């Protein structure tokens, strides 16, 4: 998206260009979310890494029954998030259970919001710097495509 926008910047056009630019940005985000629908049943794809110096969720008791899989846990811990009931959002350490797994539906809205914040952090700066604007970039996730994962 950055390559496309900066390529279009060489059209020597008035403020209208900025508006055009904004359009392109939004389009990209849309496509991304749609593409994420086909990988909604993958647990390792959505897992995130955590270090000893950060804060994490408590360990479920069942994880202590794994056996010989607990030996290779030097530094990192990989965690995913699932929803078993209503609004619960419980955690799961992926690497302590024998394969294959049997889990409820994954929680994709949480991870998608976490990614989208970082995505927007750069688009806002690009807009404010290249064209000297004053408007932040905000993507309406809650009113446009939140029904897919509900």
């Amino acid at each position: 998206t950055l390559r496309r926008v900066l390529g279009l910047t060489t059209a020597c056009v008035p403020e209208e260009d900025a508006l055009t630019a904004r359009g392109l940005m939004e389009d990209a985000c849309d496509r991304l979310i749609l593409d994420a629908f086909n990988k909604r049943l993958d647990a390792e794809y959505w897992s995130v890494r955590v270090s000893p110096f950060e804060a994490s969720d408590p360990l479920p008791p069942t994880a202590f029954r794994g056996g010989a899989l607990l030996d290779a846990e030097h530094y990192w811990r990989r965690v995913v998030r699932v929803c078993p009931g209503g609004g619960e959002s419980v955690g799961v350490p992926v690497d302590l259970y024998p394969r294959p797994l049997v889990l409820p539906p994954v929680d994709c809205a949480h991870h998608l919001r976490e990614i989208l914040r970082e995505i927007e952090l750069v688009f806002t700066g690009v807009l404010a710097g290249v064209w000297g604007e004053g408007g932040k970039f905000v993507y309406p996730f809650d009113d446009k495509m939140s029904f897919l994962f509900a």
């Binding site: 749609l34 629908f37 086909n38 009113d143 495509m145 897919l148």
Partner: peptide, 14 residues
Amino acid sequence: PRETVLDGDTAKAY
């Protein structure tokens, strides 16, 4: 109203 369009393999998946 509010409607959204799905086209391709996403239609079959949904």
